[PDB]
């Protein structure tokens, strides 16, 4: 058996316990990584095998309990556990919700409860994991169930603090750059306004490599939206060119 749940865990995981039983949840909370992976794979199996005749309220409660466990496991240091959480999350969004016609409110809940944690992992000190997490976010943004919600792009363009951790910041600017290229600004969630707010914010970041991606984003936009971009930025003059970024920006525009 997995070790007993702490008193803290029993109350917080009550809805999950109600749905899956204490044994499974104890596995999910176990200090043993194999018990955690097994628990998540068991949740995957339990949800996949739910008959369509299951009352909708039960199916919703089960989704919510599964997402509770997913949200925890997205933080896992062990790759097999993290991967099982992604497998489960992708299944809930792309298979379970549509199978049971639960509605896009449930899809929204899945994304909103997990995206912040997924984004956190893109700040990991190991490149392997940063890439895994960012690629999953990229794929989730483009799933047919998720794209029309316009959730992912909006989350990605939220303020980036100038002192934010380098790996986290780099992953964020690269995600925006990548998804913006692929999705554009029509019905995606990205707009000239929210991209420019994000990118110009990122230009203040302390790390050159971060600012450089922000410049690429702006140059990309400028090619398509010259007037809007120039109207957004401070006006070009001799004084502002004393800062290297703006010299680069405005000279770059003139090069384009």
Query: What are the two backbone dihedrals, phi and then psi, of residue 150, each rounded to the nearest 5 degrees?
Result: 55, 40
Distance CA 222, CA 59 (A): 47
CB-based contact 124:133 (threshold 8 Å): yes
Going by C-alpha positions, the residue among 128, 46, 142, 31 that lies closest to residue 93 is 142
The angle formed by the CA atoms of residues 170, 174 and 177, to the nearest 5 degrees, is 145
What experiment produced this structure?
Answer: X-ray
CB-based contact 166:210 (threshold 8 Å): yes
Burial of 6 (0-12, 13-18, 19+ CB in 10 A): exposed
Distance CA 231, CA 253 (A): 13
Resolution of the experimental model, in Å, one decimal? 1.4
CB-based contact 123:165 (threshold 8 Å): yes
32-68 in b/e form (b: 16+ CB < 10 A) is eeebbbbbbbbbbebbeeeeeeeeeeebbebbbbbbb
Query: What are the two backbone dihedrals, phi and then psi, of residue 102, each rounded to the nearest 5 degrees?
Result: -75, -20
CB-based contact 130:171 (threshold 8 Å): yes
């Amino acid at each position: 058996e997995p070790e007993p749940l702490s008193e803290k865990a029993l109350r917080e995981a009550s809805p999950a316990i109600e749905v899956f039983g204490e044994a499974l949840v104890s596995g999910a909370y176990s200090k043993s990584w194999s018990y955690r992976e097994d628990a998540l794979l068991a949740v995957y199996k339990k949800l996949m095998e739910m008959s369509v005749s299951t009352p909708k309220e039960d199916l919703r409660n089960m989704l919510r309990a599964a997402i509770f466990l997913v949200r925890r496991a997205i933080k896992d240091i062990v790759s097999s556990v993290f991967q099982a959480s992604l497998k489960l999350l992708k299944m809930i969004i792309t298979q379970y919700v549509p199978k049971h016609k639960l509605g896009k409110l449930e899809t929204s809940h899945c994304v909103e409860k997990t995206l912040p944690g997924l984004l956190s992992r893109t700040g990991d000190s190991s490149s392997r994991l940063r890439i895994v997490a960012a690629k999953f976010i990229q794929e989730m943004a483009l799933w047919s169930e998720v794209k029309p919600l316009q959730i992912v792009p909006v989350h990605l363009v939220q303020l980036l603090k100038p002192n934010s951790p380098t790996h986290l910041a780099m992953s964020r600017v690269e995600l925006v750059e990548c998804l913006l290229k692929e999705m554009g600004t029509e019905n995606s969630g990205f707009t000239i306004s929210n991209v420019m707010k994000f990118a110009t914010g990122a230009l203040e970041h302390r790390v050159y490599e971060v600012r450089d991606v922000a410049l690429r984003i702006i140059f990309g936009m400028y090619r398509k939206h010259k007037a809007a971009i120039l109207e957004y930025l401070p006006p070009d003059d001799a004084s502002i060119r004393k800062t290297v970024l703006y010299k680069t920006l405005f000279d770059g525009f003139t090069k384009i």
